[PDB]
Write a protein that binds this DNA or RNA. Structure first.
Ligand code: T1C
Ligand code: MG
Ligand code: MG
Ligand code: MG
Ligand code: MG
Ligand code: MG
Ligand code: MG
Ligand code: MG
Lengths: 201, 320, 132, 304
RNA sequence: GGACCUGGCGGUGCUUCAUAUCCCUCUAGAGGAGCCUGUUCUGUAAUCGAUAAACCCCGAUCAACCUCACCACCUCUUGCUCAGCCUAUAUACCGCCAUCUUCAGCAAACCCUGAUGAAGGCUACAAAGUAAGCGCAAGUACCCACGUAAAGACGUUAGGUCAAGGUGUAGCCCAUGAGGUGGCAAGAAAUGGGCUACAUUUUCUACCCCAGAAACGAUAGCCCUUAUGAAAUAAGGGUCGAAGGUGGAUUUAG
């Protein structure tokens, strides 16, 4: 780390920066601050979930190809949902939603797991023990399952925006392999509902 | 190649392998013998070169001087023997080192008594040798004492031991500066020392360590037999304990309030007063306890009755 | 362990000079250089033969002032004026000293073909920076 | 010591001899001028500023040799001599006594500084107990004498200030107003010129931002300071840029525009955007490969 | 044999920790394919040295001849040398290093304790420890005081090199030394490390990231030409168009 430990984290929030924590403000004006990374931005078009998914999709430092495979996915999502409102019906239309950001976010929230499995060694044999997962771990698990179910290699010639758009609309409508594997993790934890007493934490 | 040559300091470091010789030369002597004017011969101003006879004679003198040099290396040094050759037990280290407190120990003689190679185990090294030595210092006038020195080097251990014993001396009281006052029986730990006061001219018929210690103290005539464990570092300690816990004639006279008088068979029935009390004289006589309750030694009674048959006992030995 | 120019610690009785004491990682952080010749800079040609002559000078003067060079020499080289500044001891006779000065003074001039100058600096005893 | 006295004499005479060889033969040759004269006289070229030559009064050169603690009677001078720590224990005794008589009436020194003032070696817990007693004496309502005691033991702080240095406004060109700042990140340099009004325009190496920066990430990096300070289309820029790459150049520009816009935005908001992290350089630079590795921190195959 | 002192060990207890290491975790690989390059084995008339960590693109920041010490054949005798030897011993060594070390100890000299034994020396509301010196630290290099470098003692492992050079001991001098000329570096197999891939975040072309199109993989093999060289390894083109479907156990690095 090229920053000294006294170098502090910069915070970028417009609604904070307009006006208890008054001593925090004075102390922060008396600490050194470190530089802001390139990915974060004072725009409010940004979603941190969206940027995190882009960074996890990145292969070998290509944020260009990453954002490309992300913006094409979002477009393709808007195109299909727009086709939907167009070909729809008086009432159907009011129900269909087409914000490529809410659809991604809510598909991730339906994809996230609530329980997890930890391998615990006891008596030589390894056991799969149910465990409460942290929120950071379950959000990362939802995102990583989505990315691996895009790179499953069972898609053949299909391009990445087509893959992620189809998978993510299925996940928003609560179907597909990511929901299936979350259900599989949940069902295996149930097989293992007694082995949870193996936990010491 | 002169370029691949090296310093001699470096050549020997490799030859000796002690980490796991040019002094007989003048500054201009050459094999060709071109005796110069600033070197060898002083500064008439005439360059010249000696002949085949002067060269051969000078180099013959040089090789002979080398030969006498290897002689002064290969003389023999004479080490006095202590208790045996290749031992350390009677070896006299010198006077104790002069004190940095403007002090001197010049009438003091230091003699070793035991040298042991002592080892402990280390995590990194393993067997680690430390020399442990015991020495005794005395001026033959009563002041003597022993101490242990421990080091990695024997000279350092010797120095530590003697310079510590001069600070840990005793004072031994002597009868007529030749013997002990009485008979001393003492068991120190598991070493039994039995010493008898003896008349003049009896000699030091004691264990060899006791002989050296009593030569450092000034005791000239005494008998001593040691039994049990003969450990040197219990022998010296028990010897010093008994000899420093002697009871003298004046102390006996003061404690009992009576005259302490001598009866020698050499002089006759003549009474020889050796110690009178320095205070009042007690007038009740000493109680003649008939058939005294005293613990006798079976070796002494055996020698008295003549049933002590040994082919080792009264052997003709050298002086002291 | 690194063993390049590091005189190891003995028992605390080993006289040692500033030069010998410092290790190669102090080579211009605390020590500096004993030979100042220009060839090791960016653009020059003859640095190799300068060093080949350098080790020669060190060993010639070591064998020619036998057992009087206290510490190592300073072979500086400005212009064609090679200089062999020295720190030689105070044991041999001054006429012998002036002799070996002259002998060298002319012999390295005829070996290397330039002005060579020895500026001795007599010292009583071999200096001690620290006892290792 | 006679050593110290003759060293002093020799410095004085040599200092005057030093002003002769130079040219300041008038008597007052200061210590800075002494350092200046020896620098030139014999060129250093040694990385350690102690390994270079020097000409100070023997006082600073030679250390503090403690005086003899007993005369020619034996009879040591201080009454607490046989503690071996006369100065420290005399100070602790005194501080305890002032706490006592004050109770009857009613930053901090570092260990090395205290050892320098006492000319005696000290334990860390001894220092800690001394500091504890001194804090007991300030916490207790003490008088002006014990105040000068606490203040001859307390030392300076040398606080710094973390207000961003505002560049002057150069009212120039024909009649416009600008600020010309600089920025650097990952071998890239950007000198930026920002005029107070102008409604938006960049000229990065002659062309606009849509031409020099085809990547929307770079355009976001160029937006960043304006969209923080709510002055998006209210100033205009012109930037010269050398070295680096597609993101390093944009970061250097971002820093330069922020450090130039500081003069056009208020001081509370320049503090606010310093807190937001647009006014500090990024010290993250590429590291060095090492001999025997396969990268800067990357190693080879098997080692265990 | 009894009892100890010190150290090492314990599938040794309690506590506190490791953080790129201890696990759960995170990213990219190895192990599967081809090629390159070391090593083992086989082979040859055909060097030597490294050989768990701490050998295995290692002496080599480098062998067509030279290098070269190997082999074959043929020659030379005060031989470039007040010869020589790359002969044997790294278990005689200097030299320069590996390793613990991604440690903090090593300690002269004293003093005390242990009935003056091997040994041991802790309590800050303090019970005997005091300490020069080396080491960490500190100071320096690079862009900061951060990070990375350098640095890391005593010793351990008779750890690595008599072949870098020097060299003790023992040997040769018709020889084991010296020179010339020509060959030695091949795979029924195996293994270590890399390089490139098995494509769709891909492939080719422009552009150097707003297009068109496709819907793959040899730096191998054979042929041509060129570079350098007395004498071809390298380079470009042509040709071809392998096996290969992201690799189990185990493992590496951050
Ligand atoms: C046979 N052993 C007792 C032995 C003997 C000698 N030398 C002699 O005794 C010869 N002495 C004469 C020449 C007759 C005077 C030896 O010289 C050696 C060794 C042992 C080896 C072992 C080596 C081995 N290496 C090759 C992998 C090894 O396991 C290690 C290791 N630490 O990894 C070694 O210690 C080893 O390298 C080694 O040092 C040995 C010898 O040097
Ligand atoms: Mg004998
Ligand atoms: Mg190293
Ligand atoms: Mg070997
Ligand atoms: Mg040969
Ligand atoms: Mg290092
Ligand atoms: Mg350091
Ligand atoms: Mg060996």
């Amino acid at each position: 780390s090229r920053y000294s430990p006294e170098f502090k984290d910069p915070l970028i929030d417009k609604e904070y920066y307009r006006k208890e924590e008054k001593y925090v403000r004075e102390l922060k004006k008396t600490q050194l601050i470190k530089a802001a990374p390139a990915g974060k931005t004072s725009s409010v078009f940004e979603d941190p979930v969206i940027s995190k998914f882009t960074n996890m999709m990145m292969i070998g430092g290509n944020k260009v190809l990453a954002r490309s495979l992300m913006i094409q996915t979002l477009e393709a999502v808007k195109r299909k949902q727009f086709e939907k409102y167009h070909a729809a019906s008086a009432e159907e239309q009011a129900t269909i939603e087409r914000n490529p950001y809410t659809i991604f976010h809510q598909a991730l929230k339906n994809c996230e797991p609530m329980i997890g499995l930890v391998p615990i060694l006891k008596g030589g044999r390894f056991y799969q023990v149910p465990v409460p997962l942290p929120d950071r771990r379950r959000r990362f698990l939802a995102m990583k399952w989505m990315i691996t179910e895009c790179r499953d290699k069972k898609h053949q010639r299909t391009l990445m925006p087509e893959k992620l758009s189809h998978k993510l609309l299925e996940a928003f409508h609560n179907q597909g392999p990511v929901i299936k594997r979350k259900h599989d993790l949940h069902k295996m934890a149930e097989a293992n509902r007694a082995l949870a007493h193996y936990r010491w934490w | 190649s002169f370029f691949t040559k090296l310093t001699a300091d470096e050549l020997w470091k490799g030859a000796l392998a002690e980490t796991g010789l040019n002094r007989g030369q003048i500054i201009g002597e050459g094999r060709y013998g071109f005796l110069w004017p600033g070197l060898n011969v002083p500064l008439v101003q005439t360059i010249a070169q000696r002949s085949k006879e002067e060269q051969e004679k000078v180099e013959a003198d040089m090789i002979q001087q080398r030969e006498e040099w290897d002689r002064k290396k290969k003389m023999k040094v004479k080490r006095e023997r202590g208790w045996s050759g290749n031992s350390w037990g009677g070896i006299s280290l010198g006077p104790p080192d002069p004190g940095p407190c403007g002090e001197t120990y010049e009438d003091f003689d230091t003699r070793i008594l035991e040298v042991r190679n002592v080892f402990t185990m280390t995590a990194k090294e393993g067997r680690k040798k430390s020399i442990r030595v015991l020495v005794a210092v005395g001026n033959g006038k009563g002041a003597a004492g022993f101490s242990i020195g421990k080091a990695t080097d024997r000279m350092d251990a010797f120095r530590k031991a003697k310079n510590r014993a001069v600070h840990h001396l005793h004072y031994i009281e002597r009868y007529e500066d030749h013997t002990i006052f009485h008979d001393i029986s003492l068991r120190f730990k598991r070493t039994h020392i039995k010493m008898k006061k003896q008349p003049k001219g009896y000699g030091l018929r004691c264990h060899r360590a006791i002989i050296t210690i009593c030569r450092l103290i000034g005791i000239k005539d005494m008998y001593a037999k040691v039994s049990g464990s003969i450990n040197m570092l219990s022998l010296t300690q028990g010897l010093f304990r008994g000899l420093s816990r002697q009871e003298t004639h004046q102390q006996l006279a003061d404690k009992k309030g009576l005259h302490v008088v001598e009866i020698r068979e050499e002089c006759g029935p003549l009474p020889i007063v050796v110690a009178s009390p320095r205070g009042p004289l007690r007038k009740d006589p000493e109680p003649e306890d008939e058939v005294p309750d005293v613990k006798l030694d079976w070796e002494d009674v055996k020698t008295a009755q003549g049933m002590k048959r040994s082919v080792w006992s009264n052997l003709k030995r050298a002086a002291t | 362990k690194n063993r390049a120019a590091r005189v190891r610690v003995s028992k605390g009785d080993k006289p040692v000079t500033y030069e010998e004491a410092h290790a190669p990682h102090y080579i211009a952080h605390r020590k500096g250089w004993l030979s100042l010749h220009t060839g090791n800079l960016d653009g020059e040609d003859h640095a190799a033969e300068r060093t080949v002559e350098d080790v020669f000078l060190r060993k010639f003067m070591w064998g020619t002032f036998p057992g009087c060079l206290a510490d190592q020499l300073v072979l500086k080289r400005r212009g064609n004026q090679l200089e062999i500044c020295a720190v030689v001891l105070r044991q041999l006779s001054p006429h012998k000293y002036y002799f070996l000065v002259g002998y060298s003074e002319t012999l390295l001039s005829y070996f290397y073909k330039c002005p060579v100058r020895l500026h001795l600096q007599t010292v009583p005893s071999k200096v001690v920076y620290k006892y290792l | 010591e006679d050593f110290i006295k003759k060293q002093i004499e020799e410095f004085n005479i040599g200092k005057r001899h030093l002003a002769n060889m130079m040219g300041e033969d008038p008597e007052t040759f200061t210590q800075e001028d002494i350092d200046r004269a020896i620098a030139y006289l014999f060129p250093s070229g040694l990385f350690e500023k102690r390994a270079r030559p020097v000409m100070k009064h023997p006082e600073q050169i030679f250390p503090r040799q403690r005086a003899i603690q007993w005369g020619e009677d034996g009879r040591p001078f201080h009454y607490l001599f046989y503690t071996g720590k006369q100065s420290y224990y005399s100070l602790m005794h005194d501080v305890y006594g002032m706490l006592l008589n004050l109770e009857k009436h009613q930053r901090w020194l570092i260990k090395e500084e205290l050892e320098e003032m006492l000319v005696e070696k000290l334990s860390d817990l001894d220092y800690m107990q001394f500091i504890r007693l001194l804090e007991k004496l300030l916490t207790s309502q003490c008088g002006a004498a014990e105040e000068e005691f606490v203040q001859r033991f307390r030392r300076s702080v040398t606080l710094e200030s973390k207000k961003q240095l505002i560049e002057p406004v150069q009212y120039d060109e024909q009649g416009m107003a600008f600020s010309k700042s600089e920025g650097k990140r990952k071998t890239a340099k950007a000198e930026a010129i920002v005029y107070k009004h102008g409604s938006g325009r960049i000229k990065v190496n002659g062309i606009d931002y849509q031409l020099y920066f085809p990547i929307t990430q770079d355009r976001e990096q160029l937006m960043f300071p304006f969209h923080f300070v709510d002055r998006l289309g209210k100033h205009d820029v012109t930037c010269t840029v050398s070295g680096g790459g597609r993101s390093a150049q944009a970061g250097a520009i971002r820093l330069a525009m922020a450090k130039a816009l500081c003069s056009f935005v208020t001081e509370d908001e320049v503090e606010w955007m310093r807190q937001a992290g647009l006014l500090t350089t990024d010290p993250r630079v590429r590291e060095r490969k090492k001999p025997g590795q396969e990268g800067a921190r990357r190693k080879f195959t098997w080692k265990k």
